[PDB]
Design an enzyme around this catalytic site. Sequence first.
Site, short mmCIF file in Angstrom:
data_model
loop_
_atom_site.label_atom_id
_atom_site.label_comp_id
_atom_site.label_asym_id
_atom_site.label_seq_id
_atom_site.Cartn_x
_atom_site.Cartn_y
_atom_site.Cartn_z
N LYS C 148 7.07 40.42 -2.38
CA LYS C 148 6.85 40.76 -3.73
C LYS C 148 6.05 39.22 -4.60
CE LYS C 148 10.00 43.80 -3.52
NZ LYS C 148 11.07 43.64 -3.59
N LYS C 174 4.27 45.03 4.78
CA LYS C 174 4.54 46.10 4.19
C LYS C 174 3.45 46.43 3.00
CE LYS C 174 7.58 48.73 2.76
NZ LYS C 174 7.34 49.19 0.85
N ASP C 176 3.14 48.33 -0.81
CA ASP C 176 3.95 48.66 -0.91
C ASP C 176 3.66 50.47 -1.24
OD1 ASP C 176 5.01 46.52 -1.60
OD2 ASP C 176 3.55 45.83 -3.58
N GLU C 177 4.94 50.32 -2.64
CA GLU C 177 4.27 52.26 -2.31
C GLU C 177 3.21 52.34 -3.91
OE1 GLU C 177 8.54 53.12 -4.08
OE2 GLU C 177 9.08 52.81 -2.79
N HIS C 267 5.67 56.22 5.29
CA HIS C 267 6.78 55.94 3.97
C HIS C 267 7.92 56.77 3.51
CE1 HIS C 267 9.25 53.97 0.40
NE2 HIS C 267 7.90 53.06 0.87
N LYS C 307 26.77 51.66 3.98
CA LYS C 307 26.98 52.99 3.69
C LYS C 307 28.35 53.00 4.80
CE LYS C 307 22.73 55.12 3.45
NZ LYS C 307 21.74 53.46 2.21
#
Lengths: 430, 434, 434, 105, 105
Positions: C148, C174, C176-177, C267, C307
């Site tokens: 980030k 990672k 990013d997308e 991903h 969840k």
Amino acid sequence: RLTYYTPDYTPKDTDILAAFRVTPQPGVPFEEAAAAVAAESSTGDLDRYKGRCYDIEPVPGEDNQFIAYIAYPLDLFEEGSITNVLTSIVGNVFGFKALRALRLEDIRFPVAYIKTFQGPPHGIQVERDKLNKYGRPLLGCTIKPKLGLSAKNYGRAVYECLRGGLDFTKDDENINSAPFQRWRDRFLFVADAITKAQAETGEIKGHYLNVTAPTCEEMLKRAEYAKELKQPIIMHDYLTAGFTANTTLARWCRDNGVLLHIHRAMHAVIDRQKNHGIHFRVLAKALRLSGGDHIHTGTVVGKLEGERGITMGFVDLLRENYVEQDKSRGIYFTQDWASLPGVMAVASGGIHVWHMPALVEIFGDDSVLQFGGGTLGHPWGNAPGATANRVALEACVQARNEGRNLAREGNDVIREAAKWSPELAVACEL
Amino acid sequence: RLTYYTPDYTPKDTDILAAFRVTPQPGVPFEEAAAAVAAESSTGTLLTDLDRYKGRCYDIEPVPGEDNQFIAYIAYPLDLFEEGSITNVLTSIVGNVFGFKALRALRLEDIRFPVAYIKTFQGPPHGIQVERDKLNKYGRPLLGCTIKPKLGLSAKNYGRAVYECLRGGLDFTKDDENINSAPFQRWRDRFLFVADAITKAQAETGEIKGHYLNVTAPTCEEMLKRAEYAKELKQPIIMHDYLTAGFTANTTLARWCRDNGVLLHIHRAMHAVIDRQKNHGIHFRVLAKALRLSGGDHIHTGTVVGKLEGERGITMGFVDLLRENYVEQDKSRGIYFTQDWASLPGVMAVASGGIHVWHMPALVEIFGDDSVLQFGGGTLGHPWGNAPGATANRVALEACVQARNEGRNLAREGNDVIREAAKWSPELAVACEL
Amino acid sequence: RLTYYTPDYTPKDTDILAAFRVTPQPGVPFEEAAAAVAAESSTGTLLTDLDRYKGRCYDIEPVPGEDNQFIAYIAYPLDLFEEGSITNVLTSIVGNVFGFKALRALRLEDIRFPVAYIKTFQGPPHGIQVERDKLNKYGRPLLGCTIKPKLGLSAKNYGRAVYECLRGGLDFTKDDENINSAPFQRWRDRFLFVADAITKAQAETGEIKGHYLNVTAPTCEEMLKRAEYAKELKQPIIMHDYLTAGFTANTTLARWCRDNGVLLHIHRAMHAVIDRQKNHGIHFRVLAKALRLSGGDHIHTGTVVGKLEGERGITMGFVDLLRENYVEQDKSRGIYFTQDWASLPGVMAVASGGIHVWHMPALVEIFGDDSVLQFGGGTLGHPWGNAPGATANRVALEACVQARNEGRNLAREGNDVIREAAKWSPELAVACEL
Amino acid sequence: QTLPKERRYETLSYLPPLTDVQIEKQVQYILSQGYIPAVEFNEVSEPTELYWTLWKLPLFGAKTSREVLAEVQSCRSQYPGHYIRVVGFDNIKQCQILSFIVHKP
Amino acid sequence: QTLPKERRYETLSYLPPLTDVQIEKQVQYILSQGYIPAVEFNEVSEPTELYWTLWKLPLFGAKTSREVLAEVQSCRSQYPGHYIRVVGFDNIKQCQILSFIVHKP
């Protein structure tokens, strides 16, 4: 300085002479600027590698201007590179501040340095053997309108010009590929209009398929596709794309049997002004040493005796083997081309039917005549407009092959061919 | 004609504008020549639609102070030109229109490639930012010698003059215009004895030194085998004379250097044929925008120190066109069209006049951080050689970088920081007098 | 119809079963819609033999607690589909059948690729085992930041945030997308300034650090020249957004990474279009099985901590489908078909929720050793930067790895081992409060 | 406050230095899952260097007992200048279940 | 007279060794342009090695104040054997605006 102006230097037969047209600043003497146009085009050893000036020759009829003959050595320049002649000679010399306007008039590539180049892919003689078109100057439409025509409607206008006895048909400057007409589909629907116009009239019809591209990979895959349509000729805007892309495409067109129609796009940025720039007889020598089986040499019909002496000046430089130093005709150095192949001289101005007696006499057999340049078309279309320009061609070649003086009996042989041709007789007036 | 002169035509944000400087032949009125320079650069004089692909002159704006001259703003549409081809901009716009005979001179001053058309190009391989990130050289204008003599030096003696300049703080070192290969110095050996002299000067002093290896070549095959060899010597940077070699060979090498991580130094050889006369030709801010769209991380923008106020506002006009993202329409500063570059990477602006020690206040003030300062072009070297000659050209840099970063107005307090840096440097003190 | 509903058909061990979740339009009975989802995924509504290539519904099993919904188990034969093509499973099965108009919603819950059809695929390039053998990282779930900010960082500033995370014990990092290449950050420079930041952080701390270089690209040529460059930087791992880029580009890169020894981080970008609604789409345990058959050594399986019990039994259902050799039919845990993977290599299950320090007891207990734990997605970093932020995310790992390996029930004794590791780590103690 | 440049080693390196009671309680996870544990020694802990040399065997005498723990101290007296490990081994999954350093030079 | 073989480092290395008043006045260019100053430390200044380790944070004083060299003096007492930098950062142009060494070993 003033060791770069050596006026007793009789220049060697292996030097690369250059005849600038210096217009120095007020107060700059002529020996000092001529040693300065030889300065920053070299060495900004010295006795072996300096470009040196060896003659002044002030321009007759005009003060504050002279013709500085610079004598660059051979071993300064790259074997086979005309982008190193223009990097070395006219690289950092036109921007020199003690010169109001510097114009490269002529240049003498020696026999020693012409042999490093390829020359054209195919000369005059080799091109005409491939096309089987002998003893007459060839023809051409330019497909009007330039823009807008989809790849098939462009091909239909190519088929219509090439039916009427027209030899070649030019693709435009600004048609490379564009969202209305991609090259892959322009080349397809043109090569499908040539195999119909060559099957209809058995003559070898061709189209100057524009392979000018953004990259040299996209230029050769645009020329390897015109090779695999079995096309006789391509074309290449040779000053926007440069002398590294032509020499890439020259070496390709010789090694793939494709003729090359060099177009002088953007030529007039650098030679329109009569005091600054690079005169086209340098740029015509520069593409005879890179490739081209054709080059636009503009036109002769809208020019005076001096402006067509100069126009016939570089037409002999790009087409004849040996050309004598004739400064009134514009050629500043005796140029021996060392059996290099010739280049066609493509007349492409506002010429029409009635200029066929002149342009078969002025431009000889070894020429191509384009049409549609400034004229308002033909009132019956393209296939009558090309048959008009082909009957009026061969009426002038018939009279030339019978001894008729085409300066005076030339308008007669158009008018006695308008009787035995109806498509000609309506282009006979407009 | 006068169907190509639409004076009410507000041009779209996707047109490709062009501002000529038309000097028409007498008796040709201004609208009819400006419609003509919009004519023969398109749709020349019902088989299609004219009104969709035609160039339209849309404003005249006569040049102040000089009659028989105006600035014909032509508005070419987008879908006339090729995606990614800056040799189709010039074939369309300056192709068939300067030799037009109703015009005594025609000068393409400026051109507005829209955001729609900049995105088809690549830009530079590496910007200002990515060039500085590859070289790890932040917050100073970078440097360069130019190896004198140009001609005659064998490839190892050439690399010794490179290694000598690259010791003393110099960042880059330029290979000449008229050196591609020649029977005294072939390129395979010039590149070899310069890679052996970079990795000696890079390993000695821990900065990423480079050398603008000249990959200008006769053919595009010989150019890329000349650049793929400078890739395999792990060279940071090559160079290319983009107006002699053209825009097809430059855009080939643009795409190559982006796909191989080599920096590209575009050299403006043969530029003065076309940008030097004030009435005719192609102004360099067209040719600056034309190679920001094709490749180049550096371009020579000449110099400032020998020019007036008006002749350096125009030079700082096209320095901003090739280096800044958005540049406002300012015609006194030379720019005719507001130019959004659409986050295209910048190009360095290289200063390469007849410049020496005493111009480090001027060329760090005028050309900012995002620049390269060549040397050795006109000025006569240094009495102690090249490595004290380059340390003189580097201590004078970082004195003027330190002074600019302390509020010291280098326009007025500039000659003080050269003289107070010549004390702490013996190599600069002997260069302080000539 | 009802020739495609054979309720007595015991399916063969070589059929390709499929369990839809049909929500038929009213008045359409259950057998006639289940014969229809077996119809238009084959042999649509004699020239051939119908009974050899037809899809046969063989069981209905109405969903408990919700009428107008059932689980049509369809039994497609083997020789209908292509050897090795997971884009022909989806073209056959979910191709022409969801837009069927007698159905209000249709959800491919699960699918059983038989042992006969798994063997035509490649599996992952490297399993759980061969991924751990290449990285030399045994007996712990591996790690990852996510850099980030996503957008705006130049390629060197991006690699500094990579080098800072990769110092403090983080294994991976990672990309990013929405970072493939963009005018602020090209891939050739992003991969270069990350390889220069792995080999700095790998040489500093002697673990094989890696970075999920994003090779998702417009074309499959541009993808493989983006992966062959990460091969030639000797990178251990690349990544690929397999549902935007598809299964033909994934299986191309599957076959590439196996033939080039690069790990592949799959991903799941654009997964939530099709697995997020409970009534319609393709449940992710199909798309998890679909990329275990094509490539990937890692796949994001999201998170568990936000969840319920039923929504994490289903998430631990498809974590077992992509990571274990044999998985029994358990429908409360979500799996509809017993799935022998025929010794196909496993895929890591990557945890990438809005997770931080205090979730290391949970995600080492739920996701076992064979996992990767991303970070930085939702949680707001760390006050001391990235390298104390990553050491907080690594000491909290190996405290929870040490605690799990000593009998300490991390479900109940988990918050004790975070608090008793924040004492011996100053970087973790400041991350202990937020 | 910052993070120091500290070289770290393996899968339990980001901890205090592991005492003997902890390693006795650590291997009692390894051998209780049916796994065979071992001792591996090496001169340097390099990322390139991916094998470490096995000490005598993957030693095993019973279902659960002190097997490794005595052998590590015998290796601390044998090699007091090598990076000593304790690794696990699975034979079903066929990879190591642990790899961590008990002793550094 | 000649030029000695002297290894030089970064963008202010060809100067006298920069004292404390100069660096306070140097960073007062960095943060006054709205930029983000920082401190970066490294063991060696290598041309290959192109990252240096960020010390604590990319610092910032209020709009203009002295938090950078005051922290460098805390890093000269923490790491007296590392090449210490002071670097700037821009967010708009997105590159460093300075990179120069304040301290050498």
